Structures are given as structure tokens and as C-alpha cells.
Design an enzyme around this catalytic site. Structure first.
Site, PDB file in Angstrom:
ATOM      1  N   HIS A  46      30.115 -27.346   3.442  1.00  0.00           N
ATOM      2  CA  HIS A  46      28.735 -26.888   3.304  1.00  0.00           C
ATOM      3  C   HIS A  46      28.238 -26.812   1.890  1.00  0.00           C
ATOM      4  CE1 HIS A  46      30.664 -24.321   6.580  1.00  0.00           C
ATOM      5  NE2 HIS A  46      30.043 -25.306   7.200  1.00  0.00           N
ATOM      6  N   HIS A  48      26.358 -24.383  -0.480  1.00  0.00           N
ATOM      7  CA  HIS A  48      25.991 -22.980  -0.588  1.00  0.00           C
ATOM      8  C   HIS A  48      24.860 -22.846  -1.613  1.00  0.00           C
ATOM      9  CE1 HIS A  48      29.473 -20.919   1.611  1.00  0.00           C
ATOM     10  NE2 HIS A  48      29.538 -22.213   1.887  1.00  0.00           N
ATOM     11  N   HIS A  63      25.175 -20.076   2.923  1.00  0.00           N
ATOM     12  CA  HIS A  63      24.779 -21.466   3.093  1.00  0.00           C
ATOM     13  C   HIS A  63      23.332 -21.607   2.610  1.00  0.00           C
ATOM     14  CE1 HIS A  63      27.862 -22.155   6.605  1.00  0.00           C
ATOM     15  NE2 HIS A  63      28.436 -21.919   5.440  1.00  0.00           N
ATOM     16  N   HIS A  71      22.909 -21.027  11.618  1.00  0.00           N
ATOM     17  CA  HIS A  71      23.916 -22.047  11.366  1.00  0.00           C
ATOM     18  C   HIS A  71      24.039 -22.992  12.540  1.00  0.00           C
ATOM     19  CE1 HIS A  71      27.552 -23.810   9.645  1.00  0.00           C
ATOM     20  NE2 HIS A  71      28.023 -23.791  10.878  1.00  0.00           N
ATOM     21  N   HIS A  80      21.301 -24.911   8.999  1.00  0.00           N
ATOM     22  CA  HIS A  80      20.972 -24.585   7.611  1.00  0.00           C
ATOM     23  C   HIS A  80      20.890 -25.949   6.886  1.00  0.00           C
ATOM     24  CE1 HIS A  80      23.429 -20.620   8.132  1.00  0.00           C
ATOM     25  NE2 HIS A  80      22.160 -20.447   8.463  1.00  0.00           N
ATOM     26  N   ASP A  83      24.283 -27.280   5.923  1.00  0.00           N
ATOM     27  CA  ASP A  83      25.237 -27.523   7.001  1.00  0.00           C
ATOM     28  C   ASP A  83      25.654 -28.985   7.136  1.00  0.00           C
ATOM     29  OD1 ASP A  83      25.311 -24.792   7.535  1.00  0.00           O
ATOM     30  OD2 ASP A  83      24.106 -24.886   9.327  1.00  0.00           O
ATOM     31  N   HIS A 120      35.924 -25.417   3.330  1.00  0.00           N
ATOM     32  CA  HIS A 120      36.582 -24.239   3.886  1.00  0.00           C
ATOM     33  C   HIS A 120      38.022 -24.476   4.350  1.00  0.00           C
ATOM     34  CE1 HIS A 120      33.105 -21.520   3.835  1.00  0.00           C
ATOM     35  NE2 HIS A 120      32.429 -22.658   3.893  1.00  0.00           N
ATOM     36  N   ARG A 143      37.306 -20.023   1.301  1.00  0.00           N
ATOM     37  CA  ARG A 143      36.777 -21.127   0.515  1.00  0.00           C
ATOM     38  C   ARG A 143      37.799 -21.508  -0.557  1.00  0.00           C
ATOM     39  NH1 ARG A 143      30.740 -18.426  -0.911  1.00  0.00           N
ATOM     40  NH2 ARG A 143      30.439 -17.500   1.153  1.00  0.00           N
TER      41      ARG A 143
END
Ligand SMILES: [Cu+2]
Ligand SMILES: [Cu+2]
Ligand SMILES: [Zn+2]
Ligand SMILES: [Zn+2]
Lengths: 153, 153
Positions: A46, A48, A63, A71, A80, A83, A120, A143
Site C-alpha cells: 500500500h 501510506h 493508507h 479499505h 483507498h 490500496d 506488509h 510493516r
């Protein structure tokens, strides 16, 4: 316009994510090469909100969601902007590929330049899980690596 | 608007550089805290064109110079936008301070968001040396640390 993010962390995960968009209405092509992940798995990918690296990958924030949606998957209508779903890792734990995206942009008010790319440690449930968290993060977990998206040539 | 750059490298030099600008016509306040430098010295501090960290601090490119001027001091009329001069290090090799600048901007066509901040191993001659290089880089030398400028809260 081209941009790049170098994912670094202290968990053995690292890679490079490149972005490319010719004009603002055009989709952005995202290419990535990430290593050090669990082999044969799916990992949440993602963008951020903040390109803040003062506190590891934590300071990157939530996000990127300028439109205040929940999400979802890259293909969902409701997702998002940041995403990007899950990336698939091979038997050597390498995730490599590319795709185009029409919400992610390098030009204009929603530009992701100066923001962060986070990989992630867990699989993104794509907002399908039955938890409130599914709708915010997709239960993707920790993360291990991140990078600030910078302009390039 | 606020931005930050975390300077990292493999030479023992590191720090944080914060940026702040309320509106585009307003000057930007730059604050920095850098350690690991030579004690009691002056070190070139500049914003380079690319926020590309694929090849250490090298890929950051040249000084951010959208107006194609020669290298100079922050106070010179003729200087690169990214020219922040020299930072002074104390007896412990720490450079710490802040200043406002009217050319460096976080908003608009010349925004430095997504670009790089580089601290050099040498003193910036401010474009006064008698070498061609003085006019390009200020003979500041190697780049022990750098960081991509990212957006923050
Ligand atoms: Cu994420
Ligand atoms: Cu420089
Ligand atoms: Zn999301
Ligand atoms: Zn310069």
C-alpha cells in the site's frame, strides 16, 4: 513523470518500486521487485499518507485515502487510493511484477510523490474480513519495509 | 505544509531536516539536526534534484537548479534553488540550527517535495573558488548522507 521508492527495514525485507505516468488522466504503471518475504505467499502492498521516516515505517501513517472511503481491493470501486492489494512471492520469497492503476497518480492534487510505499508482513484481506480493522487496513499486519516516493529521471 | 527528510548513509553521518511553509509566497523554515560530522567545521548542505535513492546518494543528481543559474551562497542573488550553503558543526560534530529561505518552496512548480537533501563531507566554497567546479557544486566533495523529502503532519 517517473518516481521511485526504495523499501528498507530491519527485518530482511527490501526492494524497489517504480512509478510512471505520462499525463494525469493516464493510468500509472507500478513496477516492483521485493525480496526477503515469506516464500509462496501474499503480502499487503500500500501507499501510506506520509513520507515520514522518523519513526521507522510507523510514521508513514494510514493508507492514503483522500476520498475517505473504506479499505478494499485495487479492483473495488470502494478502496483507498493507496490500496494496491497483495503481491505474490515466489519460492524464494521474491515479489516481482507490475500493473497499471488509475487512482494512483504522480501528477495533480492526489500525487503520491513525497508519500510512502509499505510492504506488509501479512496478507491483505481486501476489506472482506468481518472485522472493523478489515475496513481500515485489511488486517495486513506489521510493516517490515517502507520507502518515501521520490522524483526521478 | 510540513515535510521532513531523514539523512542516512554508511559513513556515520545522520540527522533529520524539517521543512515548513504556510503558503507559497511565504519563506520556508528549514530546521536541521545532523550528527557524525567532523567537529568544528563547515559542511555543504544542499537540495539535489532527484529523490532517487537506488544508488546511495549519487542518484540524487545535481543541485536543484530549475532556473539554470550557477552555484552560490544562500544569500547570493545568483545561486541554485537547492543552495543552502554550509552548516556549522560543534566540537562534537553536531550541526544544528534553522533558517528561512525564500527560494526553497514546498508548494508550487518548484516544490522540493520528493527531491533530496544531501550533507557533504567538505566545505562549500559558495561558488567563490577559482574552479569551474566551484560554479557547479562549490567543491563540497563526497555525500556521506542523504534523505528523500517526504510529506508529513
Ligand atoms: Cu499498508
Ligand atoms: Cu550538494
Ligand atoms: Zn487501504
Ligand atoms: Zn548549488
Amino acid at each position: 513523470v517517473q518516481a521511485v521508492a526504495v523499501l528498507k527495514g530491519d527485518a530482511g525485507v527490501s526492494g524497489v518500486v517504480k512509478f510512471e505516468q505520462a499525463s494525469e488522466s493516464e493510468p500509472t504503471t507500478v513496477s516492483y521487485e521485493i525480496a526477503g518475504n515469506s516464500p509462496n505467499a501474499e503480502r499487503g502492498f500500500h501507499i501510506h499518507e506520509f513520507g515520514d521516516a522518523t519513526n521507522g515505517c510507523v510514521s508513514a501513517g494510514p493508507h492514503f485515502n483522500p476520498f475517505k472511503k473504506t479499505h478494499g481491493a485495487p479492483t473495488d470501486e470502494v478502496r483507498h487510493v493507496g490500496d494496491m492489494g497483495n503481491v505474490k512471492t515466489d519460492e524464494n520469497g521474491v515479489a516481482k511484477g507490475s500493473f497499471k492503476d488509475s487512482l494512483i497518480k504522480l501528477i495533480g492534487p492526489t500525487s503520491v510523490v513525497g508519500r510512502s510505499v509499505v510492504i506488509h508482513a501479512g496478507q491483505d484481506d481486501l476489506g472482506k474480513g468481518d472485522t472493523e480493522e478489515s475496513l481500515k487496513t485489511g488486517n495486513a499486519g506489521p510493516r517490515p519495509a517502507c520507502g518515501v516516493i521520490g522524483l526521478t529521471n
